[PDB]
Design a protein around this nucleic acid. Structure first.
Lengths: 77, 174, 137, 97, 114
RNA sequence: CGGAGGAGUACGAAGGUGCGCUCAGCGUGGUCGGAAAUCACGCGUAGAGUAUAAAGGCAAAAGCGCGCUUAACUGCGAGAC
RNA sequence: GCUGGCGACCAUAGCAAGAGUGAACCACCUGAUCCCUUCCCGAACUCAGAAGUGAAACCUCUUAGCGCUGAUGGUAGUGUGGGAUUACCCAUGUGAGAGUAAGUCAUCGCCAGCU
């Protein structure tokens, strides 16, 4: 006979692009994510596809905050 | 009832139940009269007649009740109304109660039919009235099929004994 | 023949059997237990044969507790078939046995009869066995 | 009174996976004593003595005396770890009584 | 609870003002009194305050539109004294109606732009 | 030619904005309505929902409703994947 | 010392059980004239005053009944070199999860008011 499987989708290259302690410029993308695994803090904007980008020049920092305990990424000038 | 309650009913009820604070006297908060027009989709005008008749009995414009979800056994689904309700508080409810105790009891075929039991246990009383007659409106002419109704009286009574005492003070037949 | 009533997936990966059995090595539902000392695979028919031998020889004078359940399907290609063209079909179910895993417990029978019955049962298993008893600590 | 286990001193160089395996090869069992009014003490015991004590049922309920040099600690057996297959004792936890 | 519902209603506006990082003009209303406070973007400093509990307006009713207008004028004066010119209004979950509109209009007349 | 599922659409509102609201599940009484039809209170808790397969998400809800509307614009575009 | 608002963290901070305050604040409470509100209801939103109370609710004090935090030691795993091949042993570096002893009724800033 034959098999009904044998299909897959092309890769999407998701994940973190700039790690904590690094330097960024305004407009640099920091996180590529399907959902909001990370949220935006100061000087970080969110795109329509949930991408996180930097709106200011500085140093990236990750943190855990809030009652929900969700993770935030921000830029320090 | 109107004033008679405020002037003496809480007074005697306090003297009888022995509650320390003047805020603990049970008070009748609201009464809601509701009914579902089952299988309304079949005809689609019994609901329109029912809203008119229940507006006649109670002087408040009603709100038609929509369902959520759909049941395979029944014909009902979310998007179309299936019942109607109206809630009375303050002057409207107190005059509704006065007209009820005044004329509804004589018209009902069986006196004392209401039962001390069936209380919800939280101080609220549910009653079912059969047929739209036993109320002040036009006669059987110019009015559609006979319809029942449910009346729920929600009060502030903490316990069933307090609620029963409040009904006894009010004058409910049973 | 024990087999799961329902399953999410019909076919599973082969995997690898390693490590020891730190869980399930303690007698907890009876007095005297038979425990494996090496690793391997135990089939449903082997489980049934061992249980039947033990029950017959103890003459249903006590209670047997079975602590192995086959929940891993195994597939084989039918025969006369070349390599490729998808995975094979399920033919039987097995359970992974790690050293230290308890297989059967007996409660309510005397030590001599229980041990002798376990000796009969061991002749049907594909791996070495040993006998243990309840202990305080 | 009933049980006086003779223990040694188990130090930092003797702690760790490699040291523990070496000790068990030399037929010794690492053990820990933890209780109030003092910090935990790591010691080593003899497998034959531990096995002999474990057989008795009163060993679990009675108080035991652990002797390390001049010091004597009155404790009770709190936990025991056994090899899953061979069943040999491997580690012991004692609580000061 | 009514207080919980109002706080839930006000949370979105408070978070948006926090994100925009602008000076905040908060107002609280009770059956007897109305209060206004000006707070910096960081949220740890209070630049100015006004209320009906002050000596000037205590003798009055303190819970009406006239008191709200007086409080608005006073808070605007204190904002001018402190040097704050641009603020973001925060209705704090109350409907922008009645005494709160009166206070906002009084502050706008005083000179705060919002 | 390994193991499992979906796609070749839909929507002038199912878009935008201001405002407002949280699901579902059970325990008690009530009409021809009962396992399951509408309605009151109380308990525990997100298992509801998100046009569609699954994954990652969703309280300032991204879930739900109302009024007004066309940013479902034109010229571009630092910077980055 | 007590109350209200705005902030920093989100259980060592919560749930549950017991107890207390209104002189000031807070809440309930009166009425539906005026502004405004109900897919019907001043029930909620909103306005005018204060008749009464701390009943409900907010706030504050005790605990360990839950929940939560949580060692030491050992065990599993693992990079490099060597040995062996049912997946393990040695040297060196590293080191959980679960469980145990133990701990837990939080804490810190800005503004206004009262005896």
């Amino acid at each position: 006979g034959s098999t009904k499987n044998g299909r897959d989708s092309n890769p999407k290259m998701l994940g973190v692009k700039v790690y904590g302690g690094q330097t960024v410029t305004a407009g640099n993308i920091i996180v590529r994510q399907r959902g909001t695994e990370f949220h935006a803090g100061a000087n970080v904007g969110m795109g329509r596809d949930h991408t996180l980008f930097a709106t200011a020049d500085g140093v990236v920092k990750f943190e855990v905050k809030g009652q929900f305990g969700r993770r935030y990424v921000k830029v320090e000038t | 009832l109107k004033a008679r309650y405020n002037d003496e009913l809480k007074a005697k009820l306090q003297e009888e139940l022995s509650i320390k604070n003047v805020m603990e006297i049970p008070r009748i908060t609201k009464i809601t009269l509701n009914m579902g027009v089952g299988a309304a989709a079949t005809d689609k005008k019994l609901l329109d007649g029912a809203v008119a008749d229940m507006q006649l009995i109670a002087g408040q414009k009603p709100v038609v009740t929509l369902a959520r979800k759909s049941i395979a056994g029944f014909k009902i689904r979310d998007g179309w109304p299936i019942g109607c309700k109206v809630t009375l508080r303050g002057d409207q409810m107190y005059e509704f109660l006065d007209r009820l105790i005044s004329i509804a009891i004589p018209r009902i075929r069986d006196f004392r039919g209401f039962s001390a039991k069936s209380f919800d246990g939280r101080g609220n009383y549910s009653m079912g009235l059969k047929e739209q007659i036993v109320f002040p409106e036009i006669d059987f002419d110019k009015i559609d099929r006979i319809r029942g109704m449910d009346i729920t009286i929600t009060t502030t009574a903490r316990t069933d004994d307090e609620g029963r005492a409040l009904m006894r003070a009010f004058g409910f037949p049973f | 023949m024990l087999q799961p009533k329902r399953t999410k997936f019909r076919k599973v990966h082969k995997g690898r059997n390693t490590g020891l059995a730190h869980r399930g090595s303690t007698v907890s539902f009876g007095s005297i237990a038979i425990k494996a000392t090496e690793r391997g695979r135990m089939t449903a028919r082997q489980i049934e044969a061992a249980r039947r031998t033990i029950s017959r020889r103890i003459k249903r004078g006590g209670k047997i507790f079975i602590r192995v359940f086959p929940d891993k399907p195994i597939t084989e290609k039918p025969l006369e078939v070349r390599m490729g063209n998808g995975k094979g079909n399920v033919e039987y179910w097995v359970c992974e046995i790690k050293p230290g895993k308890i297989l059967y417990e007996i409660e309510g029978v005397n030590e001599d009869l229980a041990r002798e019955a376990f000796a009969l049962a061991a002749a049907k298993l594909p791996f070495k066995t040993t006998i243990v008893t309840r202990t305080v600590m | 009174a009933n049980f006086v286990l003779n223990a040694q001193a188990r130090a930092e160089d003797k702690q760790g996976k490699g040291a523990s395996r070496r000790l068990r090869r030399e037929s010794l069992v690492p053990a820990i004593i933890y209780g109030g009014n003092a910090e935990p003490v790591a010691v080593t015991l003899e497998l034959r003595e531990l096995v002999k004590a474990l057989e008795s049922n009163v060993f679990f309920e009675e108080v035991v005396e652990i002797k390390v040099g001049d010091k004597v600690e009155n404790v009770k057996i709190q936990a025991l770890q056994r090899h899953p297959a061979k069943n040999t004792p491997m580690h012991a936890d004692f609580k000061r009584a | 609870e009514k207080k919980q519902s109002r706080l839930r209603r006000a949370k979105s506006t408070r978070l948006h003002i926090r994100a925009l990082g602008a000076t905040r003009l908060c107002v609280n209303r009770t059956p007897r009194h109305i209060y206004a406070q000006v707070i910096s973007a960081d949220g740890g400093k209070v630049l100015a305050q006004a209320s009906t509990l002050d000596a000037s307006l205590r003798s009055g009713t303190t819970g009406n539109i006239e008191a709200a207008t007086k409080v608005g004028a006073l808070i605007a004066e204190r904002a001018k004294a402190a040097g704050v010119t641009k603020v973001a209004f925060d209705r704090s979950g109350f409907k922008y109606h009645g005494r709160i509109k009166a206070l906002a209009d009084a502050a706008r007349e005083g000179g705060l732009e919002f």
